[PDB]
Amino acid sequence: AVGACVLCNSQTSLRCGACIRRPFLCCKCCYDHVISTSHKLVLSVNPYVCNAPGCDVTDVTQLYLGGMSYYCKSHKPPISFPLCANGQVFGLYKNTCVGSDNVTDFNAIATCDWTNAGDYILANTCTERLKLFAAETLKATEETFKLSYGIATVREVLSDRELHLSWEVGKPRPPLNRNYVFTGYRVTKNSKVQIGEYTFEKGAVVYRGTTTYKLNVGDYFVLTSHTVMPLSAPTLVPQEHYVRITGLYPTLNISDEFSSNVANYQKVGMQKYSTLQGPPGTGKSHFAIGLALYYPSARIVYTACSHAAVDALCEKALKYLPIDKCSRIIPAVECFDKFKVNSTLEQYVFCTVNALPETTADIVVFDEISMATNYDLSVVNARLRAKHYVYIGDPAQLPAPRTLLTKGTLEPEYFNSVCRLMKTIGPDMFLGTCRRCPAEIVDTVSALVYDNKLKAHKDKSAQCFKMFYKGVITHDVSSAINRPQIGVVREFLTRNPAWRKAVFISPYNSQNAVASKILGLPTQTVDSSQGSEYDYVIFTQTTETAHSCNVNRFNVAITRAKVGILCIMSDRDLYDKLQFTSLEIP
Amino acid sequence: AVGACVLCNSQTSLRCGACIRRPFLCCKCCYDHVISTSHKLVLSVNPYVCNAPGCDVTDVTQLYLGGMSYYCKSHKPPISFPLCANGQVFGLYKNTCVGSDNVTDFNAIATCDWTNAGDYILANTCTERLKLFAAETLKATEETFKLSYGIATVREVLSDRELHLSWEVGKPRPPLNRNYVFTGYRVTKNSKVQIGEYTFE
Amino acid sequence: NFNVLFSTVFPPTSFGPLVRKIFVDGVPFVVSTGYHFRELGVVHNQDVNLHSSRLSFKELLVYAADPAMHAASGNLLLDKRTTCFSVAALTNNVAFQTVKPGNFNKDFYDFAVSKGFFKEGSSVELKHFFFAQDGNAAISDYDYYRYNLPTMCDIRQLLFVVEVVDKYFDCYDGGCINANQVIVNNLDKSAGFPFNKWGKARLYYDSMSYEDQDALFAYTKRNVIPTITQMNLKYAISAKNRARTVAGVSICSTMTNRQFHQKLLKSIAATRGATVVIGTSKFYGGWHNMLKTVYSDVENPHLMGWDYPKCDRAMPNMLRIMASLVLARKHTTCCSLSHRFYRLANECAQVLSEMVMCGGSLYVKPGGTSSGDATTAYANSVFNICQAVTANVNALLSTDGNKIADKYVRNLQHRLYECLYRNRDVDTDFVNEFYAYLRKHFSMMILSDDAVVCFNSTYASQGLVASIKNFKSVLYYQNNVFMSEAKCWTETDLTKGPHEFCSQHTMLVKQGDDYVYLPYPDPSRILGAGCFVDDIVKTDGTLMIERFVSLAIDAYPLTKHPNQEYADVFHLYLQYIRKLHDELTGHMLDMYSVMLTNDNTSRYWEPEFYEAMYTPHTVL
Amino acid sequence: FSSLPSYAAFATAQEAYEQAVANGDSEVVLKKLKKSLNVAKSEFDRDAAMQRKLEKMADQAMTQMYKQARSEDKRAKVTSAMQTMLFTMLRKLDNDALNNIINNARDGCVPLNIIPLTTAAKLMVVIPDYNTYKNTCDGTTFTYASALWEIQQVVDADSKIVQLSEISMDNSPNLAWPLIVTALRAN
């Protein structure tokens, strides 16, 4: 009930009641926020509401203080005193305030119902605590929106890859894939019982989860909305290039995992943070593995953003680094348990930001910056307080599932504070070495966003195919379908024998489900499917609208396949920019 | 509690709140200590501060002596007389006090950072007890400016007489020879443990 | 009554709390969910939940007061110093606690000696000191519970004595009160174990809001909460060299016992002219009024007083149950029948037979009273009245009825036998008749196991009214103690009051125009309080002059005593007060320059300020 | 107390009236002066009293709310302390013997007095004198409560180590006798 206000940092006892997160407001700030905005409720050690029996007023500018309680105009005693006066609300530490002038932007942040692009513009354009508050309230409103959904009434199950499941009345079908996790809890007689961490395929219900339970009666599948804890640390800590390498020990020999990893260490050893600006399959994986043994006496942390993207997080660590030096952190969902759980002392911890064993370090690595918000940066900076760290990830990737915005797409400058921090002043690191890839992605993404700092390592045989087909779009439900995909898969496998074992990018997951039901291709997620790409992939049409195709969803999709990248021109794409081979359908 | 201010030859219970050794100054002597410089806080048998819960007043020039207690300016029950008034500060020995002719002894040498030659100059231009105050304040400033540097520690050990050494957070390092003996302590989990006497050059 | 007899066969390790395992967020606990009493049988809790989420504040308070976890997370203990049952040791060391001597006020002693005091052959000498004790004193004093034995009662006679006692307790009102009507004084006292590791009673009375207290109080009408009692040693002046120990009850028991009993306790301590004299003062003519009330209109008056050897270590359990039931009879509208039984069970489990923490170990209390609960003195008064009533009944029923000259008393004895052994239900008319007979021929004044009785003498000689021998026999066969008649007195002259009541003697002096009764203490007690103190409290009189003012107030009536040193005590105190004041003024004017005034201060060394405290006019 | 809303009017009227008086005008101006100044002071009176009442009311309200906040902070810290104590004492329950004797019960309830008697790992014995000692814990291993215990340490009333070789009949009067014996459950 006592703390610092979000603007003056002065001691206060007043909580605003019309903001969903109940921030701590300074008395002058409280007056400014209650006058210039329809936020007319204030909370103190006791609520600032009329206590007259039978009365109901919840204003602040309307109440009068009398005796010991608070009263209104209709019940003010002869000894009365208005709470809202002198442009300053009545509360503790009223004489030790300083006020602030950043009230209009704070009002806009509080009043912004998160509708248009300017919402995120001003979310990313403010001072530190306002960034934290905006991120917190954005996650709060999105989790409230997703919890405003029904309960999956289930009473029986057909079999594996089949399910009958019913939502509530007046509630629509929730979003489809693992980006919106389905984790429910049924009841037997008195309490809740375990169901399983799952996700649904289509509407036939195949299971893309990782378990199988005796599912039937009284089952409650829900997208579990979690209470959000308040933030402590800022989104980033301002760096300063050291002169002493404190704690860091370049070994006598050279652990030559990679050649340029020496330079890696050379400039990541002095600044309080860094970032691994990695194009797909371009050293985005094991530079930290080399750092593991070149700096073996340094406490090194590894993390990502989702439990799905732990492939390179967990493989080479056990593959080449010593067995004992690794450590595992997994809540107990289904993920790689290759290292040791329940071990506090170790130098190489591998996990996600979901849950860690609270400790501090001096070296951290952090993956998947593209779908990372300032909330995740703040929580990783709070849980881990290190000396240097790297944010693995590239702006030429996908945004976080910000379904909140509908009008304007969220561009690289609006991913998070760090993702534009390396955009304005330049990246901490810039690689130009593709591990295993022909120069198609080189040409494409170097003309688009890579600025041609990486060039042809593998030859361009021009086996990849792009055609003149356009496609037709039709909406049914929150997922759509494509007749010039139900026919187009067959029309494109007519005689070409090379893309029969390709992977299916899924702008619409229901369309991929229908393709699997009819012809059959593996389902490939869009956002959380980096590093899971095979050697051979089809980029399908699947859409023409502003769902996916402005710039930054295909920058990694062009790199899914290595030699045979069938990226047909679907819609208002970057058609007249390069050279691509084509075959005309009969 | 009851010490001695001797330049004014005055037993006292008062002392300056923000100063070197919590020095003892009589009523008029504390007064010209708090008007010739800025020392607006004093300590008596009990410290002078408003006694209502939640109130905060560091200053003494506006406190009042209320109902067997002290109250203040911003939060003012003023049924009292002011604490600081009539060339004096309220306390015992308010009548048997003399004062000081040389007003700026403390105001000169207790107000600088105890490192200029003027400190020792005036210390030699003192009396026996005044120069005793001087010498004790020199020892106090020696220790209080020695306790502003780092603590060396050996975290991984090497062969004796050739080790590795990391130090502290941001602080500077003092001179280098064996003048400063590095005799610290070891911590197992919460306690202090036998270490010995060391020296880093 | 039958359970008391039958419980002596079964093993002693099958009595007490019954525990089981519950789960809170997947972790296992061990909590108490019932009790097995020697008297009340098996009792099970009504609201117990095995699986639960994170617990609240009152659940934490309840689980932190249960001895189950403390006993289950401790070491086994076999103690051969005592013969009482032992449970567990909470630490790896045994704590030995000593008692320190007193502090000597040399200035007062020299002043008294310089005025002709403490000479050889004098009638006033010091016999009150601070005695010191060695390490193994607390356990040696706790080992006195071996005098508590299981006692079966004559049920057909107890069921009539309880009716007569309830008739005695009839002019009051009581019931339950809300948490906002509870009055607590001195909230800066201990809260018991283990609550004394974090604060006093103020912390727990502030941290708990009103509906939390109400919910906690309503929780104990369907469940049983066993607690832990801590034993402490006293540091006070006395005349004998044995250690004294009091019991510190837990806060969770006192907090609810107050809400249960405070209305009746306050109603008892506000009535004047009743049998129980708790609340009446002795100043402003109170002593004379009490003495005149107790004399009533008895026909051949004598006075008598008795004594209880080992009163609290030897009181049987059945009488404590009876006292609790008598006190709890005012709840006929605010409480149901199950609520009253559960309140009785909670009281029995907390202050009659529970784990005590002596030294650093847990023991089992066999029985008796734990002096220090919320209802000590009133229960003692009920017990005293019960014993007096059964002594009168035994005196009347054991007399040859063929030699009783009066026929009314013969019919009364016949009806008494019929109502005791030939009637199954209550007969209110005879209860009223016996109560009137007792109040006419046997008058009492009771203050928590201290009593003065004015009785008809010829009736007692003929055997129609209880005597000292009847009290001796009743105590022998119902209390398991022997009452020597060397600690009892008898006074056949009413112009001199009781020989001793509440450690005060009585004298009949002439003040104004009439004659009144005044109490005076033992001079040795006053002088010992003057000369032996705890440090800082004295040995410097100027720092506390208000001690001697109170001590001289207590010692005023000694000036009317025919003996001469007794008045000299009061005069010496007055002269010492004047000397202390003069010392303060001069001793402060000398080194400092503050000048003192003697306005309305001389009243403290003149007798008129003290004479007004014993004259009936009621000031402040 | 000097810039009240009515202060300006009162002071201006007083100044004008006294200037008129100093002008030496007729008695009518003096009567008007007296009436105007009387009513001006009368109206200033309540404006000077009500404000002083209100300030003290506000100060009392502030003090009460501050003490309420302090009480809440103390409650939070005592709750944390109690939770810590409970969860710390939980970690010594020996959850295999306790589970073994709980499952044997017919409904899950067992007396509390037999839990340390059958599941404790350590035993402490306090011995008054040597005659009692030689009948209870003579030797190095003894039997009590249908179990076998072996001695681990012996201290005295002063908490100093005592070796079993000097606990004899001849050397008995040279020890602080309230001896404490510590043993462990065998096998």
Next chain:
RNA sequence: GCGGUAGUAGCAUGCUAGGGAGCAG
């Protein structure tokens, strides 16, 4: 000419709250 009302000062009376001390069971 008498009374009413509004502040201000001194004095007395009983409660509530806080602190220090004494006795009794």
Next chain:
RNA sequence: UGACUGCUCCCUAGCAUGCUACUACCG
């Protein structure tokens, strides 16, 4: 390490009531 009640004395702060006094308004 300091239990539950009862009574009494001293000091300060607030509230209510009453007595007197000094100005002012009104009739």
